[PDB]
Structure formats: structure tokens, C-alpha cells
């Protein structure tokens, strides 16, 4: 199933998360949404990256056109924030308990899922960079 979504990826969607890492990130988002510790829009994520709030920024790799969110990767690299792509925008929205898609989510750290957050954070920073 995963390999079918890999057709729909962007030119700029790297580093793409591994199939198991994608699953870890969704489970971390579900816990963060329950705790009220995420940001969802480009409108939102852009605002709190500017303020300097830390978090793992998860991006949808099938977002088109790329102009809507392609500024965000460099905004993270300016502030050394960890970011990663995942196969689809619909699943990223579905992870946050929504029927409508979204192209980006930023997961904030919190005590209730601190171990799961650190497990995701560790693997995100370890990814090979293009």
C-alpha cells in the first residue's frame, strides 16, 4: 500500500520518512492532539516557527503546488528545527482526527508522550539529507 503513495510525491519531498517512522509519527500526533499540543495550518506552523517554538515539523509529501509550503523547510534550517516528509496529506489530517487533509503539522513536546516524542525526534535528526 505504501509504495502506491510513493508515486504521488513532490520534487522537494525529502527526507521522506520510512514506513515504520511514518507510523511512529502518526501515533505521536494522535497523543499530541489529545493533549492539545499541535499546530496544523501553514498559517499556524509559520507563525510559531517565527516565534521560535520548538517541535517536530511533519510535512505532506504529495502537496501541490509546492509554493504553498516550500518556504517552511528553510525556515526550519535557519532555526535548526527537525523536519520530515510523510507520504500523504490525507493521512496527516487523519492522524490529527480530521476528514479534511493538511500539508503540515508541528508536534510540540509534552510529558505524557515524552518517550515517543524523543524516539521520533532521534530518528528524524538521523535521516540522510539531500
Amino acid at each position: 500500500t505504501y509504495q502506491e503513495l510513493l508515486v504521488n510525491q513532490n520534487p522537494i519531498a525529502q527526507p521522506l520518512a520510512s514506513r515504520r517512522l511514518t507510523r511512529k509519527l502518526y501515533k505521536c500526533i494522535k497523543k499530541a492532539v489529545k493533549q492539545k499540543q499541535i499546530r496544523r495550518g501553514v498559517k499556524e506552523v509559520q507563525k510559531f516557527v517565527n516565534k521560535g517554538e520548538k517541535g517536530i515539523m511533519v510535512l505532506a509529501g504529495d502537496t501541490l503546488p509546492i509554493e504553498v509550503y516550500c518556504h517552511l523547510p528553510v525556515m526550519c534550517e535557519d532555526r535548526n528545527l527537525p523536519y520530515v516528509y510523510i507520504p500523504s496529506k490525507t493521512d496527516l489530517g487523519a492522524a490529527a482526527g480530521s476528514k479534511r487533509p493538511t500539508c503540515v503539522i508541528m508536534v510540540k513536546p509534552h510529558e505524557e508522550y515524552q518517550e515517543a516524542y524523543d524516539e521520533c525526534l532521534e530518528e528524524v535528526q538521523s535521516l540522510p539529507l539531500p
Partner: protein
């Protein structure tokens, strides 16, 4: 909005309402990204469009 499209084999836009083309790929929105004149992310867009070889200057030059 409602209008989507996919490219045919000779590079022409084929308009459609459906979210998937006849080969199972996702269709793009027909409309361009919303623009702001107070956009200050020009550096950022050039930076990664250069990185992935998709900046307009790196494409095949048009025949005039």
C-alpha cells in the same frame, strides 16, 4: 476549489472534477497558489528549488 487536472502524454492539461486521474495518480488543483505582495520568503523558495533542480532557471530553456 473544484477544478483539477492531470497531464496527458503530450503535456496538455486535461481538466476533471475527480481527485484521481485514469492511471491512479492524484490530480493537481487548476488554480495557482495564493499570493501576498508582503511575502518575505523569496530566499527560502529559491534555496530549495535550487537544491532539488526545480527552479525555473535550471529547466530546459524554451524555444522561441
Amino acid at each position: 476549489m473544484f477544478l483539477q487536472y492531470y497531464l496527458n502524454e503530450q503535456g496538455d492539461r486535461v481538466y476533471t472534477l475527480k481527485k484521481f486521474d485514469p492511471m491512479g495518480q492524484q490530480t493537481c488543483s487548476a488554480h495557482p497558489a495564493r499570493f501576498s505582495p508582503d511575502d518575505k520568503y523569496s530566499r527560502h523558495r529559491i534555496t530549495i528549488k535550487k537544491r532539488f533542480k526545480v527552479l525555473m532557471t535550471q529547466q530546459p530553456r524554451p524555444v522561441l
